[model samples]
Target chain A: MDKEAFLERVREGAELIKMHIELGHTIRLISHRDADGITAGAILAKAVAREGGTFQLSIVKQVSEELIDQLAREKREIYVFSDLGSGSIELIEEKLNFATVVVADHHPPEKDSFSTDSHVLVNPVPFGANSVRDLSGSGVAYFVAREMNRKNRDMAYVAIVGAVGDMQEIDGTFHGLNLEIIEDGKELGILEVRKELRLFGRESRPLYQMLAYATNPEIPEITGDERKAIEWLRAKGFDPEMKYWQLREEEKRKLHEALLVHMIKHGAPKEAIDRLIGDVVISPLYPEGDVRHEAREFATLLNATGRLNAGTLGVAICLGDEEAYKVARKMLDDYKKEQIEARKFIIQNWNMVEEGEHAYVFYAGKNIRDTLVGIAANMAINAPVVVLADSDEDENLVKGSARTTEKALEKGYHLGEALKEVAEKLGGEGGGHAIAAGIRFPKNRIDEFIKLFNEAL
Target chain B: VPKEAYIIQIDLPAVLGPDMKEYGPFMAGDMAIIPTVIGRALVEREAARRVRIFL
Candidate 1:
């Protein structure tokens, strides 16, 4: 769409939301089960609550026809979908014909959509917005929420977390609408940026373990080997028990040199190493000692909550529920435990993840959660990794997650578009960002699906 | 190059030296001696702000 048309659509969406509030419509807010989706739900929930309107929120892995039918049966006056519904537009429009619908999403909208006068689609793709790297689903939600109430700008940082959670960032920062949202976060004094190693547990984990678990540019010998990491630290005259932020300057230099050597020896592309260290945004909401306080870490925590079947807990926390924070913390522990165990299993059964001529393939079958297979694919260093697992919802469906290394992306690999095309051909539904994407296909066609996926590479 | 070192306090958890050698996974209040080049880089990046050179 042209610039004027896009702005007109946004205005129309905001006006529809205002009309619903004016009509005192009880809203039904539906979102996905990821950090972005949860954050979007939280934003809309707060917006509706502020208007003294009631809302029922549901977070699901996918928007199936059954879910839409249920929503239609409820007959809510306004049905709001955040971070999702772009893919299931037809079903929603068909079933929820009685309600005024608003889709605040960043994913590519399904083509051949018939829309009523009351349906407002607030997406960025057709508007010429770079949906992949420019904005997240929550960013679109924030746009609408800000229109609902200027005070909704306070929720800007939450949307930043959502964007980061969706991995809509590149080269250590965001772009387009995401950058504008970050400016809001900065203006709110809730966000800060600093240069550092972009790894998990910057504040909490011991230095040695931090290196051991660093996967983005997996350092050979040091990564995933605690003993080896500890030995390396000790050899450099650094205490293994010290936290990462506590190292002496000289010790840091020694460690840096060693890691650089390791990365070079392992043939990590310079782009990957550059990505390994760069600017990271920080949030002040979390206490000083807690790792979960950081924006990216908080995003990861929210993701864990969603993956572990406690998405409501995440939404509660996002909505400023103190008790929910405590419960979510416990859920985070359980989620991390499962992830560690899964990583260990994958490492032990290395043969299960094989390097095909074009991609790294892993058929985790029943062993790993479909939500987490993408993470397991991170073990592949040089190529794109595709992980397939049996769907918990339907025995006839198989879930697939694909991830590509920065080097592979540089070589012009587009996992999202590739998977979407391949999945459709294999009789499934799928699409995501270029670097990370997913697919759900017929379970019986695993072999043929893998063949097509490799050919797509 | 001069074989000079300096003492500094790490403000962040992760730091790297001139040649990209790994440095402290240090805590906010932790202080250690490091090469001058690394210390300068940390100070420049504001990863570490306080430093004392060998007198």
Candidate 2:
């Protein structure tokens, strides 16, 4: 529980990574399909190469029986898993053989899945750190990367972006091990922390759309209302024509105050507005033309890429490919357009969403990508939500993503735990942070999943 | 607000302004006088930095 104990675990993890380096083993890197996972993979892949080792990276939606079996079948010198694999420890235990497995993950592991004799498992949860708050998968990878090469400390910015992408940022600051990473980033000049408006497209979008598309903590009147946002700017004597970062300080101050008043007047939850003004990370390494110059925006770009199943593009961007940036930007634009269509689909089929005692359930069918359903669920319902859609790989399998608000969490909702419970009973597997989780099950059994998930909630 | 606004060169290619009322899609090095509001915020946000010019 103490700081010393946590450091020892980190040291042990670093030592394992060093052992791999000493052996010069080629690493087969497996990571999740999100901003965090992609960044984590980039960090480890770069570190592995820097140490005179080679690696091949694969991005997966989640660790499953098929994934574990594939890993078991493909013999490699070493296997490194990041962002995911904590929940799939049982499957790994049953299938993986002979190869060394090192997991630098932050998800809550399954109960009693790790034995004393198991190879290196660098999870922050068992080390008395908050996986949700302190360390993300990329944060774990950053620690290992630093141990491999001290220069990798500059990679702290990437880890911080990963944490923010995972929504581990609360109110403006990253806590626990994440704070340490932030400190490292700031000290290294890879990151600068400032109290700025927590909106995306600060440099890209004009003032109105910046306010209009503020979705994480959806603002009333302004969000999803471009005219209202422009009107609000004009009413306050601010220019609607300027880009977000181009607003004057006086204008920003006035707008910030106005937003506070508006959010309070509309009875938005305190936690939602808590993000309105907070510490933001700015990455100077990303060129001025790139959307990733701001850390949160970078995270959003990666999120859009991953959710669109173009995670390889995200990985390429992380690896510092100039061409990848242009391609990824186009992918982000397409992803946003898809999101618009998905939102409309939800509204057109609003009656399909069912209200439950503790959660709202919806079957998105093939109307939306499974990756986008959680985002849609968050946008559509105030309660904890479970959105099911046909998997991209299999028509018989349904992919589900669950999301909840801070208000729902206050009301004793833990979507991840509830999902894990329901999933196990239904012969599926699920795990993630408390507010967000995912699962996959038989497509025909969605009704059973809904019933049991609601019951568990 | 100051009577005479600060002006800076647009080093980057583009800076979005009023809709269709565009700012420069400038080359790597291009000079453009900027409004006080736009210049200051862009400097603060590090989209473009300040340069001194004595006329």
Candidate 3:
């Protein structure tokens, strides 16, 4: 659809939020997991609180019958659902007596019962809105928020961060409503799109996967003992903190040289070596040496906040709250340290496997949260998809996470849809967007889940 | 048990340790990094077991 028609919902969504806020309603934000979801929730939550109100923010992993029951009991004023609609919509339909639900998400649903007269469902698919490809959850949230508080235009910058965080510009820059938000933020001078060194490892731009592993997520099981593993990598003289731009440039340069040497010694392809050199944060982004350093430090701080600390802390700091900024800075440092330690732990547990038929591997971990999915998926590049469920070591309460090749899945191969069908028959709830999705199973039926997952893929 | 050259397990050690059942007949918590000589022997036994050889 064209731009004007596509953005119609953004306008409507903003009106709803503003209307509710003016009515003296307390906004309770619950967004899906991942960059888009968090950013979207953050935008709404930040905007709402900035207008002299309070919020209860949560990072939702999955929606289930129990969750529905919980929300039903709360008798909430308004529950703003950000970036998750599939599983919750069906359940919400069943128990709509309590809270007023406003569904805001990017995924396209296979069916359209979600857009009923009973609730306010804002999705790109039914209305032909292009939030999926064009606007992210944060982008939509920003638009809705802007409609409410148009006079305070400076807040629009957070929307840009949310879009970038979700990799919205990855697909040949913003195409749909996303470009409009980018322009809107830029017009307000809040949006700044510059190349910042990634403090945490993520697939930000396309075709740079090999170089991106410096901040390798999904901590790989170590080939040997954890200590020996660290020593082995360190002996290669590869700077472990190459993933961390918070380090000094000289240190990063040394790491860059070491990474080049290691890759050369290991007979890695010249292209991969070149990309590593081109990719690593060897220096700074600007030529004004001090200015560049400041930017790198700032970006590192931003990443540490998002990657390690809850993103709300980072947004609070960005919004110029001195106390929140101080707390956030400390949280950033702590988060980086935790990410580093977690990386080491993952290396120690690295499990190499012989060749396998499935392009993916599905393991079970019960207590694992949704955040770990990206880490696992990024690490297990040998297979196309890494489908792991959260199960205790002994097996109970099976929750699953799937990470895959974005390129492959972007072409309509949806892991979420594929798994949900199986998860439902086993009497569990499952659903989300295409690229990353999850499911939960009764503890006893996990093996059967493994069988079904393997068969489907 | 005497250490054997286990070729099938050569790649196994990188991702899993001796304790893992996939590595075959190894004690729990034992490091899988083995010498080539020891690795070759384990590989032979593993291969035999896979093909059901009585040797």
Candidate 4:
């Protein structure tokens, strides 16, 4: 919305808060699950709590039909949904007729019906007026939090947590409303931009490796601690720095060389080299094109918040809570343990994973941990095989995710189309990014589901 | 960790047919094609040699 409108909403909300406080309905809260969702939840919770409101908190994944059904029955008043309403507005609006519902999210709105008298819908696309579609749910939630306390220095880091959680920083640059948010953070003394430095050859080899680890360039070798990688590079006489623009020519060359070596080690054929090209730079002032994230670790962290731990912890770390540092350390330890177990699970169950040549490597398993599924698929980025998960969370419902690396197999073999067949056979649900896909299935047909999935891939 | 999807960009010439006609519309980058096709499997043990380049 325009600045004037935004100001008006803030004023109106502020006035309502005052009224609510006078009425002793000071207990208010905002709750969400992932980095974006949890960050949003945390911000709103922090805001209301900061204003002396009792902010109760709970973490959740997406709100399924069942969840909507339950919330309908509870009949709680003044529930604000952040980052999740865009997807489930129908269920909430139609099924749960609450006293007052406020939605602050970034997901694409399926139906604007929530904006009616029943709910206060604030989404980047709808009410954002100028919100970037790329902004995470937490980012939007942070905005509301900012309203609660303009001097809340922690909100800046909250934005980072949400952005990084959503993979918005993958490009090494913020886009859409995210850029605005970052600028605001910088203006507010919350964000500090740093230039990336190189320590090795023409194209920093270690830097490339780190980036590869972060971006999961070709099947990530390591993740969640790319900064630590700089230490290894330092031992090898390589230096590191964070730069907004491209690195020096020598650094670029060394990085490229390192990537080439990594590829060779992977047994990539000579044909793939012909496709080696960089981004399209329109002008130094504002270039428009596809530049890639050399590091894939961010994906791991995002997935960490998305799948494994309570996302609030992640946001807490971003909000400058020293406590989160200790938690992240422990969390990383847990992540490593999970990674090993997952790898061993794949090895022991290799027969379950289909062997493919065109893509990277492909694997699927029934009863796999839903939390580890995202990390597992990313581990196989090099092969670009569609990663699939058939979860046993509920016998009546099945879940699966498909990740695509077929850029090398661009003959209409996109993962979305392939998974469509799998979904149909199991009569489940699925959809998502073109390269990254997901699906759900019924528990009874795991064997047939596997067969159909194999055929589709 | 939650399941996630990522596209690994590999140089087409390193893995498959070098020409666009053979591996048409592959991802473009330095010795790496952003293969839009990806799934959830570990990289092949043979990937080292499959995606390499001679000095």
True contacts kept of each: 0.00, 0.00, 0.00, 0.00
lDDT of 3 by residue, A1-457 (tens): 5446435655665665656667756455666555566557656765665565534455555566876666565455666778776446767777853556677776775354444553666666665656456777766676667766774455455555556556555432456776666566567554445333333332221112223333321122222133443554467554443333344567556655655565577666554444343211212222322211232233345555555534444444444445555666566566556545544444554473223343455452532344554565555553245445465433456666666676877565677777788788888878666767777668678557656765665
Model 2 lDDT per residue over A176-214, tens place: 888889889888887888787888767677888888998
Error in Å for residue A176 of model 3: 1.3
Which of 1 and 3 is ahead in TM-score?
A: 1
Chain A vs native chain A, TM-score per candidate:
0.72, 0.74, 0.55, 0.63
Error of 2 at A363 (Å): 16
Off by over 4 Å in 1: A1-5, A112-114, A245-258, A334-457, B1-55
Give the higher-TM-score candidate: 1 or 2.
2
How does each model score on lDDT?
Answer: 0.73, 0.73, 0.51, 0.50
Model 2 misplacement above 4 A: A111-113, A116-118, A334-457, B1-55
Docking class of 1: incorrect
TM-score of chain A of 3: 0.55
Tens-place lDDT per residue, model 4, A42-131, is: 566556645544333445667678766655554555556777767777667787665566667766787744654646566656554433
True contacts kept of 2: 0.00
